[PDB]
Amino acid sequence: VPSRLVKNEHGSWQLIVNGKPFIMLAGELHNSSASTTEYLNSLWTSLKTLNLNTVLAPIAWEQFEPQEGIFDYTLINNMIDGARKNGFKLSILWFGSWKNGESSYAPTWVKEDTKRFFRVKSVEGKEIETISPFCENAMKADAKAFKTLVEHIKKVDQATGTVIALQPENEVGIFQGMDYSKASLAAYEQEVPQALIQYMKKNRKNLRKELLSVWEENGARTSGAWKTVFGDNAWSKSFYTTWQYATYIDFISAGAKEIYPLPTFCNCWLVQKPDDMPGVYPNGGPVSRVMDIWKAAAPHIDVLAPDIYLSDFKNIVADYHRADNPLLIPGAVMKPANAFWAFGEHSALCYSPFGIEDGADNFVFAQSYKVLNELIPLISEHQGSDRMIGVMKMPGESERTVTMGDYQLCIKYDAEDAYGLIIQTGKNEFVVAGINFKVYFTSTDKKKTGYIKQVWEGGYDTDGEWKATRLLNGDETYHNAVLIAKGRRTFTSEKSNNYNADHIFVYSPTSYQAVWSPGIYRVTTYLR
Amino acid sequence: VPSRLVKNEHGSWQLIVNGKPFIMLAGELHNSSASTTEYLNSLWTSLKTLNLNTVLAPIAWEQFEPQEGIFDYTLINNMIDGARKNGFKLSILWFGSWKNGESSYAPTWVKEDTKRFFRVKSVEGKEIETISPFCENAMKADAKAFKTLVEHIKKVDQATGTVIALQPENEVGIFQGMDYSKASLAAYEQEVPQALIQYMKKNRKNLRKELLSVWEENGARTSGAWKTVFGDNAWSKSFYTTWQYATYIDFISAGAKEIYPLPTFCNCWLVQKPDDMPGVYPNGGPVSRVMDIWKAAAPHIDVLAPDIYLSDFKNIVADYHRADNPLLIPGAVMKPANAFWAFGEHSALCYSPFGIEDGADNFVFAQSYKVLNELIPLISEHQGSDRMIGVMKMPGESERTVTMGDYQLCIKYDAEDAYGLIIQTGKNEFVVAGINFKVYFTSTDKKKTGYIKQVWEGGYDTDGEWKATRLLNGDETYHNAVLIAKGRRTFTSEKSNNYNADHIFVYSPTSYQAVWSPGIYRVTTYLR
């Protein structure tokens, strides 16, 4: 297989694509944007301006299997062709049984047979436009269609590896406390599967507190029915619902894994607010609260991947990043700070703004992905190590202090939008990337004086070699008192006529207004 | 004849041009814009940008017969040539005896001979700049010139049919209660024509309440003078004045119909305000109040056509559209909503903004005509059908609810400017065109569930074949909860810089601002 997840010397998972470490500098198309060849083909040049290396794009079951047994390879073939022609990798999103909780992408022949493919029932007894996760017919039909898709991908792509990942379903779950279908009601009464109990015993110390607390409130029993082991309540209902979803999707993934195993992730719609009960978000999806249930139920799913559109980004990513779960963000906001934080602080595999094709000529985001691309080899070398951190200011923060080997770094922010990453590449050497912050280096050990030795601004060329554009000194480093991560500059056409001395004094007359994006800096340090 | 009016299976009148149904996506030139070949010829490229298929343009009697018996074919010839070169059909307006009530386009040799061609007189006894409709010399002179123009058109156009319709005179009538010329005063004393009496007897159930009530109030008499049959009042005055106008113009039309019968319409200056008496608007014109008088008097006039510049567009068009009177709007505002409403709700033959050459920069209007052109075959097939409706929001309105066979449609407006049309093309299929509304589909039969099955966005190509641009799903249909008629999108060059999440959540980042115009959607539904 040309794409594989492999744990590195630090215990961080890495994506190895065509034999090298690969980080998805990605974006996800709008949902309907891959539904015709012409519409998708109209987007490639937009996407290239953003410097993506990876596009997340859906294949819909309704179009892929328009009548049962009859497959249409038009869209996957054209998608793969266009990605190759435009220098992109693909992560294929499978909009099958469920997309945002519902079954709107199921085939017409699935939708119209509600006897074979039964629906979720509301508390009111009404069938909704969601196939029940308790319907094995649907599970089997979805599995067959997905495995057929993956068979084809292997046939047309095993040698090239344009396709590097798979996402079965999209943000699954019900907007209810439970499914009231007869099969759901019956499942709730059953014995808790031993695979879950055995996972909880084995992983007891590291279980989510949400699962552990319910289990323990009911005696932490190692057998019995759902309502015996977890009580009769919203959580027990969520737990057996989640078990069913993870189980159904695991079955779909396993069929694919058996013939062509690619890195496979499932994505969640987040618990939007801390008090929210299951069903205000999709009940069943791999939110962090039920991470253990998904891991226990679905070993053919590699990663549980948060879709993040909320402002509390740093806390959210820390919540999803675990020893058994690399950070992978398939839908997010088009904000470069978030990318640098995910990649540098949490060694993330993917950052992917949603609706990417509508953001062409977002210049700062584009130049941010250019800089991240230059850094992929170095980021890859330091994933999971304590020698790499992110930088990202949040409202009301003024600094970050960290210790890195012999040095203390005081990161101070110079604007609301301040972000980047820092890698200690050497005992006395750092690479700093980003914008709108400064770094002060001092000695950890107080019997010594630590100082910047030399600062170089630059980038990595198309061969991966460091090329310096300036040795930054004097005004540009306040005489090596500090690293200023001002960023790479781009003058605009607009006149600036800025010639007056501004009263540490630096005279910086300017004729044009300018635009700024992350820079890359190599700092050597010394102790005396 | 290459243009004719023919009633379809639904009893709606259609214009059949060169043997195919034709709807006039039209505009009228400013009055003086066809007065030289150079001035007209400078307009054709402007007109093409608006996606017109038809131009309404005048021929002026003063120019066509500048000396009695001497005809100048320069302007008609150049107009037909230009229309053919630029792919337009023509409706020819004949500005003869009257235009906007007055006689300013009568030839100089008519104007100067008030003995032969006598004028309307005011209540003060002043002769005005309007030829009296009681002057048979002017009727016959106008008729001879009009026939001569129509003979020429047949000679140069009977095979091509660039000219598809004729409008004799323009907004006729007097700004007085009655004409006070000798002949007018004598006519008021005459016996009501039997053709009017018999029309009222036979058509009583469909008569205007304006005419029926005055008849009834005076005993519904079947003989007697105007003042006996209708009383001595402003209405009686309007009725005999209107009879006169309709008779004079019928004679003019009849001479052309004998030699080359083209669809023929006469247009009105509306009753501007409900209390307005005859004479505040042109007394004699075919306003809906006296439409029965026009129908009784003028069998050689096919359509009575309102010029509409007032905002109460829906009430007005419903007032003019009758079983014996298709909707034809030769002068209107340049507003796409009005077009969609006229064509969809009332199966109109023509929509025509006045002063069209001035509106060449109207992107949205141009794109609206592009979509209506794509829909002409489909609109044509459903004219007069209960399967076709229009959509148009008026201030303060929130929704429209309609039944279409098995489905109930709830149309909700998402902006002030919300318009389009809806056609049920199948038991379980709809075409929806337009912008800024949503359509919710449910089942009429209360014990079934109706839902959207699939949604495509697209258009009709230059062969008339449907071409889908997307299968709309997910965010784009709220997971098939609703049809969103967002419209066809055109990015402008203007920067948007719009990357913030906006808290059903959809993440829609945009680099450029956009303009929207009507789209076309194909919606399949189902019942489970």
Side-chain angles (χ1 to χ4, degrees), chain B residues 337-350:
Chain B
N338 289 9
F340 275 89
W341 186 258
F343 294 126
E345 192 72 9
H346 290 284
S347 296
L349 302 182
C350 175

PDB file of all heavy atoms in Angstrom, chain B residues 337-350:
ATOM      1  N   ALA B 337     -38.384  39.835 -11.028  1.00  0.00           N
ATOM      2  CA  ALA B 337     -39.493  39.194 -10.328  1.00  0.00           C
ATOM      3  C   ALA B 337     -40.764  39.272 -11.159  1.00  0.00           C
ATOM      4  O   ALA B 337     -41.525  38.319 -11.191  1.00  0.00           O
ATOM      5  CB  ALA B 337     -39.744  39.807  -8.949  1.00  0.00           C
ATOM      6  N   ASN B 338     -41.010  40.445 -11.746  1.00  0.00           N
ATOM      7  CA  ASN B 338     -42.234  40.700 -12.498  1.00  0.00           C
ATOM      8  C   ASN B 338     -42.339  39.739 -13.677  1.00  0.00           C
ATOM      9  O   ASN B 338     -43.401  39.185 -13.968  1.00  0.00           O
ATOM     10  CB  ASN B 338     -42.283  42.143 -13.000  1.00  0.00           C
ATOM     11  CG  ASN B 338     -42.494  43.175 -11.894  1.00  0.00           C
ATOM     12  OD1 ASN B 338     -42.442  42.845 -10.709  1.00  0.00           O
ATOM     13  ND2 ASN B 338     -42.702  44.437 -12.235  1.00  0.00           N
ATOM     14  N   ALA B 339     -41.202  39.514 -14.346  1.00  0.00           N
ATOM     15  CA  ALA B 339     -41.165  38.602 -15.479  1.00  0.00           C
ATOM     16  C   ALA B 339     -41.543  37.185 -15.062  1.00  0.00           C
ATOM     17  O   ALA B 339     -42.388  36.547 -15.714  1.00  0.00           O
ATOM     18  CB  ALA B 339     -39.794  38.650 -16.135  1.00  0.00           C
ATOM     19  N   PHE B 340     -40.875  36.691 -14.003  1.00  0.00           N
ATOM     20  CA  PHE B 340     -41.096  35.327 -13.531  1.00  0.00           C
ATOM     21  C   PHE B 340     -42.559  35.142 -13.120  1.00  0.00           C
ATOM     22  O   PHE B 340     -43.173  34.120 -13.453  1.00  0.00           O
ATOM     23  CB  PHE B 340     -40.099  34.974 -12.422  1.00  0.00           C
ATOM     24  CG  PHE B 340     -38.745  34.474 -12.910  1.00  0.00           C
ATOM     25  CD1 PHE B 340     -37.690  35.350 -13.169  1.00  0.00           C
ATOM     26  CD2 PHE B 340     -38.544  33.125 -13.170  1.00  0.00           C
ATOM     27  CE1 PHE B 340     -36.474  34.884 -13.617  1.00  0.00           C
ATOM     28  CE2 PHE B 340     -37.306  32.667 -13.592  1.00  0.00           C
ATOM     29  CZ  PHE B 340     -36.290  33.551 -13.862  1.00  0.00           C
ATOM     30  N   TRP B 341     -43.115  36.139 -12.419  1.00  0.00           N
ATOM     31  CA  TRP B 341     -44.511  36.083 -12.002  1.00  0.00           C
ATOM     32  C   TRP B 341     -45.428  36.057 -13.220  1.00  0.00           C
ATOM     33  O   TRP B 341     -46.304  35.193 -13.315  1.00  0.00           O
ATOM     34  CB  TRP B 341     -44.868  37.239 -11.062  1.00  0.00           C
ATOM     35  CG  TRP B 341     -46.266  37.107 -10.518  1.00  0.00           C
ATOM     36  CD1 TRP B 341     -47.385  37.771 -10.921  1.00  0.00           C
ATOM     37  CD2 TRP B 341     -46.699  36.196  -9.497  1.00  0.00           C
ATOM     38  NE1 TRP B 341     -48.470  37.369 -10.189  1.00  0.00           N
ATOM     39  CE2 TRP B 341     -48.075  36.397  -9.316  1.00  0.00           C
ATOM     40  CE3 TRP B 341     -46.056  35.239  -8.715  1.00  0.00           C
ATOM     41  CZ2 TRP B 341     -48.818  35.668  -8.396  1.00  0.00           C
ATOM     42  CZ3 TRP B 341     -46.802  34.500  -7.828  1.00  0.00           C
ATOM     43  CH2 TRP B 341     -48.158  34.731  -7.656  1.00  0.00           C
ATOM     44  N   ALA B 342     -45.199  36.970 -14.179  1.00  0.00           N
ATOM     45  CA  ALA B 342     -46.080  37.024 -15.347  1.00  0.00           C
ATOM     46  C   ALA B 342     -46.043  35.702 -16.103  1.00  0.00           C
ATOM     47  O   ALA B 342     -47.108  35.182 -16.475  1.00  0.00           O
ATOM     48  CB  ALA B 342     -45.746  38.159 -16.299  1.00  0.00           C
ATOM     49  N   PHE B 343     -44.835  35.171 -16.327  1.00  0.00           N
ATOM     50  CA  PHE B 343     -44.692  34.000 -17.200  1.00  0.00           C
ATOM     51  C   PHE B 343     -45.175  32.746 -16.481  1.00  0.00           C
ATOM     52  O   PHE B 343     -45.890  31.952 -17.083  1.00  0.00           O
ATOM     53  CB  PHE B 343     -43.274  33.806 -17.737  1.00  0.00           C
ATOM     54  CG  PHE B 343     -42.772  34.877 -18.695  1.00  0.00           C
ATOM     55  CD1 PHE B 343     -41.572  35.541 -18.453  1.00  0.00           C
ATOM     56  CD2 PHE B 343     -43.537  35.284 -19.780  1.00  0.00           C
ATOM     57  CE1 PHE B 343     -41.117  36.514 -19.320  1.00  0.00           C
ATOM     58  CE2 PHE B 343     -43.083  36.272 -20.629  1.00  0.00           C
ATOM     59  CZ  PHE B 343     -41.854  36.854 -20.427  1.00  0.00           C
ATOM     60  N   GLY B 344     -44.864  32.619 -15.178  1.00  0.00           N
ATOM     61  CA  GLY B 344     -45.168  31.404 -14.440  1.00  0.00           C
ATOM     62  C   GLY B 344     -46.599  31.326 -13.908  1.00  0.00           C
ATOM     63  O   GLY B 344     -47.240  30.279 -13.966  1.00  0.00           O
ATOM     64  N   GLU B 345     -47.072  32.408 -13.305  1.00  0.00           N
ATOM     65  CA  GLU B 345     -48.381  32.412 -12.683  1.00  0.00           C
ATOM     66  C   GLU B 345     -49.472  32.594 -13.751  1.00  0.00           C
ATOM     67  O   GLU B 345     -50.532  32.003 -13.656  1.00  0.00           O
ATOM     68  CB  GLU B 345     -48.437  33.504 -11.610  1.00  0.00           C
ATOM     69  CG  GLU B 345     -49.666  33.366 -10.727  1.00  0.00           C
ATOM     70  CD  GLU B 345     -49.658  32.209  -9.740  1.00  0.00           C
ATOM     71  OE1 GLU B 345     -48.625  31.526  -9.563  1.00  0.00           O
ATOM     72  OE2 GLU B 345     -50.697  32.053  -9.068  1.00  0.00           O
ATOM     73  N   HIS B 346     -49.225  33.437 -14.748  1.00  0.00           N
ATOM     74  CA  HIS B 346     -50.276  33.879 -15.650  1.00  0.00           C
ATOM     75  C   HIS B 346     -49.963  33.451 -17.086  1.00  0.00           C
ATOM     76  O   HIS B 346     -50.631  33.891 -18.004  1.00  0.00           O
ATOM     77  CB  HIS B 346     -50.461  35.396 -15.515  1.00  0.00           C
ATOM     78  CG  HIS B 346     -51.065  35.809 -14.223  1.00  0.00           C
ATOM     79  ND1 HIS B 346     -52.417  35.639 -14.012  1.00  0.00           N
ATOM     80  CD2 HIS B 346     -50.557  36.253 -13.047  1.00  0.00           C
ATOM     81  CE1 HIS B 346     -52.723  36.025 -12.792  1.00  0.00           C
ATOM     82  NE2 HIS B 346     -51.609  36.429 -12.184  1.00  0.00           N
ATOM     83  N   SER B 347     -48.928  32.637 -17.317  1.00  0.00           N
ATOM     84  CA  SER B 347     -48.689  32.112 -18.660  1.00  0.00           C
ATOM     85  C   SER B 347     -48.588  33.235 -19.710  1.00  0.00           C
ATOM     86  O   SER B 347     -49.022  33.088 -20.856  1.00  0.00           O
ATOM     87  CB  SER B 347     -49.782  31.103 -19.042  1.00  0.00           C
ATOM     88  OG  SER B 347     -49.764  29.949 -18.195  1.00  0.00           O
ATOM     89  N   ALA B 348     -47.924  34.345 -19.370  1.00  0.00           N
ATOM     90  CA  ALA B 348     -47.898  35.539 -20.200  1.00  0.00           C
ATOM     91  C   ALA B 348     -47.208  35.277 -21.532  1.00  0.00           C
ATOM     92  O   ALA B 348     -46.313  34.454 -21.600  1.00  0.00           O
ATOM     93  CB  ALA B 348     -47.159  36.634 -19.483  1.00  0.00           C
ATOM     94  N   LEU B 349     -47.532  36.088 -22.549  1.00  0.00           N
ATOM     95  CA  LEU B 349     -46.919  35.992 -23.862  1.00  0.00           C
ATOM     96  C   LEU B 349     -45.713  36.911 -23.971  1.00  0.00           C
ATOM     97  O   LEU B 349     -44.901  36.724 -24.868  1.00  0.00           O
ATOM     98  CB  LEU B 349     -47.943  36.414 -24.919  1.00  0.00           C
ATOM     99  CG  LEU B 349     -49.253  35.630 -24.967  1.00  0.00           C
ATOM    100  CD1 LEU B 349     -50.088  36.163 -26.093  1.00  0.00           C
ATOM    101  CD2 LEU B 349     -49.022  34.189 -25.126  1.00  0.00           C
ATOM    102  N   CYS B 350     -45.681  37.955 -23.135  1.00  0.00           N
ATOM    103  CA  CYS B 350     -44.688  39.004 -23.291  1.00  0.00           C
ATOM    104  C   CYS B 350     -44.468  39.701 -21.957  1.00  0.00           C
ATOM    105  O   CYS B 350     -45.431  40.025 -21.261  1.00  0.00           O
ATOM    106  CB  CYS B 350     -45.168  39.992 -24.343  1.00  0.00           C
ATOM    107  SG  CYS B 350     -44.114  41.436 -24.551  1.00  0.00           S
TER     108      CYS B 350
END
